[PDB]
Structure formats: structure tokens, C-alpha cells
Amino acid sequence: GHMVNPTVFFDIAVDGEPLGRVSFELFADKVPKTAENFRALSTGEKGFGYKGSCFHRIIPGFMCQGGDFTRHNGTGGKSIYGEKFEDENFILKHTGPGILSMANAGPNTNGSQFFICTAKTEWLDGKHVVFGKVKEGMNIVEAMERFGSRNGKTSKKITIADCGQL
Numbered sequence: 499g500h501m502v503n504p505t506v507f508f509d510i511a512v513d514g515e516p517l518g519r520v521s522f523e524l525f526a527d528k529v530p531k532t533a534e535n536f537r538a539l540s541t542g543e544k545g546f547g548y549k550g551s552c553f554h555r556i557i558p559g560f561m562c563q564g565g566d567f568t569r570h571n572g573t574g575g576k577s578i579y580g581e582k583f584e585d586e587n588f589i590l591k592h593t594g595p596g597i598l599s600m601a602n603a604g605p606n607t608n609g610s611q612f613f614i615c616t617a618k619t620e621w622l623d624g625k626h627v628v629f630g631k632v633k634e635g636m637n638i639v640e641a642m643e644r645f646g647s648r649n650g651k652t653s654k655k656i657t658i659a660d661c662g663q664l
């Protein structure tokens with residue numbers, strides 16, 4: 499039947515202690531290639547993905563950034579496409595907290611890194627591809643955010659202990 503936008507979850511831990519679950523709606527109806535990359539990385543079905551990775555940069559009042567499952571510090575990551583991939587479109591905008599958007603290193607350089615906004619970040623519109631939004635557990639993102647700092651360094655280790663598709 500109709501394509502239902504997928505829902506994926508992250509189970510977050512703080513220094514190894516469970517914190518809670520964040521679930522996301524992925525806008526496969528509007529950005530199918532970008533949504534599918536994140537979905538498959540969340541299930542691990544290609545043999546790699548987000549499980550066990552960390553949020554390396556958290557800036558209170560701005561965003562939480564993760565998805566570097568290869569180098570754990572913001573210098574790595576990889577997509578499911580064998581190469582960094584194009585900015586699919588910029589239809590969706592950075593409208594407020596909970597927006598899920600791709601990190602990148604220039605035009606058409608999407609990999610696996612992403613960020614969850616904790617504020618409206620409209621100056622990123624047309625530069626970063628928005629492809630989902632927090633569905634449930636924004637409170638867990640708010641709890642994660644408290645472990646960030648001005649320069650983004652986290653004061654405790656924030657990990658994706660489990661993830662997958664609901």
C-alpha cells in the first residue's frame with residue numbers, strides 16, 4: 499500500500515547508563531534517498547551503522563551531532579551508497595527543535611553524520627538536507643543536551659546503545 503514514512507529509534511546511554519529512547523519520523527515521502535540512508539544505518543542491515551556510536555558534539559541551545567561511527571570524533575562516517583551522496587533537495591526547512599538534518603563538508607557531501615536541532619536553525623536552510631523529525635522522546639534529547647558545552651565537548655559519553663526500526 500501507500501509508503502508509510504519509517505519510524506526509527508535510538509536508545510541513548512550516558513556513561514553506559516540507560517537514559518531513554520528517541521524516535522524519529524523519516525520523511526521518505528519527500529527525501530527518499532536521504533531517509534533510506536538513515537533508516538538502513540539505524541537497523542544495521544548492511545553490516546554497519548549507528549549502533550554503538552556516540553554523539554561527539556553537543557552545543558546547548560543549538561544541536562546534538564552524531565553519526566560518525568567510523569572515527570568517533572566528527573572526521574569519519576559513511577553512507578550506504580559506497581560514496582558521499584548528493585543533497586537530495588532542500589524542500590524541508592529547519593523550523594525548530596527536533597528537526598533531523600544532515601551534516602556535511604560542502605555541496606553534495608552527505609555521509610552518515612547528522613544533527614538533531616534543539617533550537618530553530620533557519621540559517622542552515624538550503625545548506626543541510628532536512629530529512630526527519632523527533633516523534634517521541636524530545637525530552638531525552640533535552641536531557642542529552644545538558645551534557646554538552648559551548649565548544650561542543652560532552653561532559654559524559656553519550657552513546658547510541660541500541661537502534662532500529664519500529
Ligand SMILES: CC(C)[C@H](NC(=O)OC(C)(C)C)C(=O)N[C@H]1Cc2cccc(c2)OCCCCOC(=O)[C@@H]2CCCN(N2)C1=O
Binds near residue numbers: 611
Ligand atoms: C560532517 C563532517 C564531515 C564535517 N566536516 C567538515 O566540514 O570538515 C572540514 C571543515 C571540511 C575539514 C562537519 O563538521 N560539518 C559541519 C559543518 C558546520 C555547519 C555549521 C556550523 C559549523 C560547521 O561550525 C560552527 C558551529 C559549529 C558547531 O556546529 C557544528 O560543528 C555543526 C552542526 C551542524 C552539523 N555540522 N557541524 C556540520 O555539518
